[PDB]
Every structure is written in structure tokens, then in C-alpha cells.
Design a protein around this ligand. Structure first.
Ligand SMILES: Cc1cc2nc3c(=O)[nH]c(=O)nc-3n(C[C@H](O)[C@H](O)[C@H](O)COP(=O)(O)OP(=O)(O)OC[C@H]3O[C@@H](n4cnc5c(N)ncnc54)[C@H](O)[C@@H]3O)c2cc1C
Length: 498
């Protein structure tokens, strides 16, 4: 069971790694716990929509759940389901629920495709040891090209009924002296125009996104992973979850892997050894594997930084009630295109995404998912009893995030004479959802738990390439930063180490 290189996971950091390793001629094996999403379901489609969720929508749950913010309208379509290897996983900790994708392509399968580059001045603040010039001149441009990032046609956007909810919020924000910015995406906008014209099968215009897109979205299986497979040096094994990592007596690495079926049944436990080990299991997946290894003594040389510095990228979701004369439209595109930029690097910094409402009818609701600058951080601690890493994060740690978001939208409300919706997130009457996370960052911070290139401190030929490297915050949607950073690290690693 020997393979020169093994990449754990198939997300952004893992995808970049596999391609570059394949191109360099290194035989690589990717292990992914989720499924390869290429089989059509009971309805003929691969993925289920948000209006017709089934077992494909969730990772081993006994009932579907309405997307955050749409409970009042989408709870009606929920049904009981058999636990299955679905695409979206809600991982619940004490006071924090983290949503992560499961399958070949990782989070790219379930995300809104927003590809944004962080402000340079902020990037320099969060990672002072990294050369920002190399990132902005070479790696970010390289990431955007390979991801197939594209821009929306501003004329179509301005006249289509599908983005009226976006234009409405732009008018409101404008009144409060705030500005909006167009956000690039990996969803083919040209394809989106043809959807509106009824020329091609709808996906983004058919209330699809969080459980995957049947068309239009260029997820990693279509970009990095397709190219990696094309090298003839990369293979991908699905439904294979890595449990433990240890170092052989001669310096190599050995892994214990559980092969399961789609129903969760354990089919076999395998031992796979390698020379170069790349971790791309995400902020949660990589961190857990490392804290388990350290605290169970299989990798006793990991430092105390492993598991620290976790942040939810300041994620806060709020909602505003529009006046009757400001309808947002019954037909709303599932892919965001506009954002409110109020990020200046201060404590009141806010970058808000104008999120769509999948209801299908007029709600007069304007939904936002704010990204704030909150210094609070959590820590992953290993629980030897249950054999799981537990996140030590308390709801009160999100107060700064809530305050910053509230400061912004309080301005918009005052200028437009509007109020917040308090009944969208639960019966608790909360205008701000502060216990969820779509963008987990940290746990194995760059330069802390690793060197400046993701080499895990204390070991040789052991690398971390994903979201766990980011120090809890970036100020914008994270996947481009994760991809560009992986480009920077793997290139250096292949040159010096491999
Ligand atoms: C609803 C939603 C909306 C979002 N929208 C956006 C957006 O618009 N723009 C943006 O920039 N970002 C967005 N994100 C966040 C983005 O998806 C994540 O930041 C990104 O996917 C993180 O990349 P990663 O490489 O670190 O790990 P991930 O993409 O999470 O991938 C890790 C992979 O490793 C696998 N893995 C885990 N542990 C194991 C194990 N032990 N063995 C085997 N395999 C394992 C996982 O199953 C998974 O496939 C959103 C995410 C969600 C949930």
C-alpha cells in the first residue's frame, strides 16, 4: 500500500497540490471521504435543488433542513431521509455550527462560487511574514485563471428580473452613502444569460446552489481536479476517510483509512503508506487529524500551535424588511453578484454579500451575510473519550462581529426608515445569526503550526495546504486566497523538497 504522495481531501488546497504534483511527475493518491458526484439521482439529476431536498443534500442526517434564513418558507419542503453520504455537512460544536461540503471537489460543490481577492493592506496585516508582491503579481492571477473566474455582464444584470433583489439593496445602501461592488464568480455567467432566455437547462435560476449545481458552476472537479487527472499521475479514491496518521521508523508516513459505502457501512480498514503527505481536509478536517495525532502520540512532535487560531471569518447573517414599494422579486438568482464594501481595516470593517432568498414568492426580505474583523479566536481541543476534536468557542466571542455588522445596517435602516426581520433564524427573536459558519479559517496557522510554506513544524515531508493555514480571517470570501496560497506553497515545496 505504498504511494509516493498522498493528498488527504479534495478541496481547494488539495486540488492545487494534486495538479502540481502530477505535472512534476509524482504519482499521487487523493483520499476523499465523500462521493464522486457524477451519478444521476431518482429525478434524473445529480444534485437535488433547494426546493426539493432529499438524502443527497445532507451528510448522514435523518431529516433535511432549510437553508439559513429561509426557514419561514422552505421548512414546508423538508422530509425525513435515510442517513446517506450527502453533499452538505453541518458540523455542530457547543456554540457553533460549521457547514462544509463532502465529496470530490469539497466546498466548491456547495459554495456560491464567489471568487474575491482580499485587500492587499489587510493581507499584509494578517500574514506579515509572507511576501505580498509575489502573491498579487503571480499567485492570485494564477489562481483566478485556473479556477475559471469570470465577470457578469453589467447590462444584463441591470435589466434582468433575476437580480432585482440585488439592485434593490444597492439603492438602499446608496442612500446611506455606502457603495456596492461587483463580485467575480466561477459560475459561468454566459451560461446564466442563456438560462434566463430559456435556452439551456436552468440551475442557478432553478433554486440550486447549497446542495450542488447541476449546470453552470465550475467546481474543482471541472477545473483543477480534471486537469490533475489528465496528468495520468493522479488517482482519486472516494468514500475513504483517513482516521490516523503516524510516521514510520524510517521517516515515511502511514495512514489508517476506513472505506465505507454510501449508507455509512464500514467495508474495510486499509493501511496506506507514503513519502510525501499533503493535508487538504479543510480547516476542520486537517486540524482534527493533527490534534488527534499529537495527543494520541502518533505524531508526538507537533507543537502547541496545532489546533489554535480558529475563526469563522467574522460570519454574521442579518435581514432587513423592505417597504411594500420595494419588492425584491419572486425570481431571484441563486448566485450572488453584488457586495457592500465598507471594509477599511478598522474595527468597524464590514464586507457584506447581498444574498438571495430561495422562497420563490415575494417576501420583501433583503438578506445579507456580513464578513467582519473580530479578533476573537477559538481552539480545537482533542477529546480522547469520544476520539474527536472539539472546538472551544463561545457565542459571546462573536459580539464584536455582531456589533460591527449592526453598526453598518443600522445606518442603512436609519437612512431608509426600514427595520430588521427578527423571525428568520428562529423563535428566539434574533436579527443577527451568530452561531453558524460557512467560511472556517485556521487551526494550523501558517508560520505558527507550520513554516511560511505550510511545512508542519517538527516534521519533514508533512504539509498542510488548506483553510487551516489562514489566521481566522481574510475579510472576503476565502477560496481564492486558499487557492493562491496553495499555489505559492506547493511550487516552493516541489522545488526544494520533492
Ligand atoms: C454554503 C456555503 C457557501 C460558501 N460560499 C462561498 C463563496 O461564495 N465563495 C468563497 O470563497 N467561499 C465560499 N464558501 C467557503 C468555501 O467553500 C470554503 O472556504 C472552501 O471550500 C475551503 O477549502 P478547503 O480546501 O480548505 O477545504 P474544503 O473545501 O472543505 O475541502 C476539504 C475536503 O476534505 C475532505 N475530508 C475531510 N476530512 C477528511 C478525512 N479525514 N479523510 C478524507 N477526506 C477528508 C472533505 O470531505 C472535503 O471534500 C462557502 C461554503 C459554504 C458551506
Amino acid at each position: 500500500g505504498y504511494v509516493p504522495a498522498v493528498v488527504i481531501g479534495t478541496g481547494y488546497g488539495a486540488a492545487v497540490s494534486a495538479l502540481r504534483l502530477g505535472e512534476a511527475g509524482v504519482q499521487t493518491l487523493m483520499l476523499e471521504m465523500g462521493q464522486l458526484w457524477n451519478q444521476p439521482g431518482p429525478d434524473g439529476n445529480i444534485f437535488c435543488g433547494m426546493l426539493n431536498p432529499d438524502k443527497r443534500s445532507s451528510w448522514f442526517k435523518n431529516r433535511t433542513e432549510a437553508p439559513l434564513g429561509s426557514f419561514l418558507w422552505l421548512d414546508v419542503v423538508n422530509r425525513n431521509i435515510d442517513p446517506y453520504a450527502g453533499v452538505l455537512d453541518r458540523v455542530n460544536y457547543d456554540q457553533m455550527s460549521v457547514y462544509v461540503g463532502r465529496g470530490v471537489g469539497g466546498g466548491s460543490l456547495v459554495n456560491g462560487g464567489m471568487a474575491v481577492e482580499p485587500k492587499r493592506s489587510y493581507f499584509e496585516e494578517i500574514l506579515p511574514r509572507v511576501d505580498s508582491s509575489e502573491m498579487y503579481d503571480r499567485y492570485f492571477p494564477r489562481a483566478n485563471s485556473m479556477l475559471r473566474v469570470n465577470h457578469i455582464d453589467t447590462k444584463w444584470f441591470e435589466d434582468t428580473e433575476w437580480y432585482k433583489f440585488a439592485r434593490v439593496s444597492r439603492e438602499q445602501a446608496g442612500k446611506a452613502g455606502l457603495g456596492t461592488v461587483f463580485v467575480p464568480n466561477v459560475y459561468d455567467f454566459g451560461y446564466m444569460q442563456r438560462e434566463a432566455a430559456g435556452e439551456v437547462p436552468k440551475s442557478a435560476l432553478a433554486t440550486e446552489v447549497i446542495y450542488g449545481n447541476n449546470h453552470g458552476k465550475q467546481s474543482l472537479d471541472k477545473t483543477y481536479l480534471a486537469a490533475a487527472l489528465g496528468t495520468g499521475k493522479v488517482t482519486i479514491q472516494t468514500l475513504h476517510q483517513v482516521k490516523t496518521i503516524r510516521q514510520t521508523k524510517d521517516g515515511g508516513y502511514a495512514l489508517t483509512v476506513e472505506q465505507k459505502d454510501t449508507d455509512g457501512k464500514l467495508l474495510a480498514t486499509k493501511e496506506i503508506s507514503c513519502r510525501y503527505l499533503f493535508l487538504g481536509a479543510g480547516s476542520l478536517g486537517s486540524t482534527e487529524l493533527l490534534v488527534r495525532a499529537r495527543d494520541t502520540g502518533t505524531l508526538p512532535n507537533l507543537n502547541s500551535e496545532v489546533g489554535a487560531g480558529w475563526g469563522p471569518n467574522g460570519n454574521i447573517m442579518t435581514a432587513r424588511a423592505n417597504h411594500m414599494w420595494n419588492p425584491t422579486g419572486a425570481h431571484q438568482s441563486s448566485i450572488p453578484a453584488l457586495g457592500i464594501d465598507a471594509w477599511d481595516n478598522s474595527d468597524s470593517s464590514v464586507f457584506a454579500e447581498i444574498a438571495p432568498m430561495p422562497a420563490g414568492l415575494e417576501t420583501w426580505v433583503s438578506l445579507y451575510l456580513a464578513i467582519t474583523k473580530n479578533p476573537q479566536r477559538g481552539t480545537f481541543v482533542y477529546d480522547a473519550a469520544t476520539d474527536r476534536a472539539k472546538l472551544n468557542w463561545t457565542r459571546d466571542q462573536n459580539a464584536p462581529a455582531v456589533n460591527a455588522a449592526k453598526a453598518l445596517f443600522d445606518r442603512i435602516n436609519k437612512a431608509n426608515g426600514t427595520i430588521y426581520r427578527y423571525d428568520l433564524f428562529g423563535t428566539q427573536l434574533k436579527a443577527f445569526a451568530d452561531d453558524f459558519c460557512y467560511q472556517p479559517l485556521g487551526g494550523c496557522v501558517l508560520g505558527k503550526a507550520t513554516d511560511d510554506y505550510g511545512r508542519v513544524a517538527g516534521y519533514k515531508n508533512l504539509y498542510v495546504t488548506d483553510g487551516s493555514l489562514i489566521p481566522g480571517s481574510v475579510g472576503v470570501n476565502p477560496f481564492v486566497t486558499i487557492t493562491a496560497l496553495a499555489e505559492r506553497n506547493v511550487e516552493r515545496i516541489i522545488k526544494q523538497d520533492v
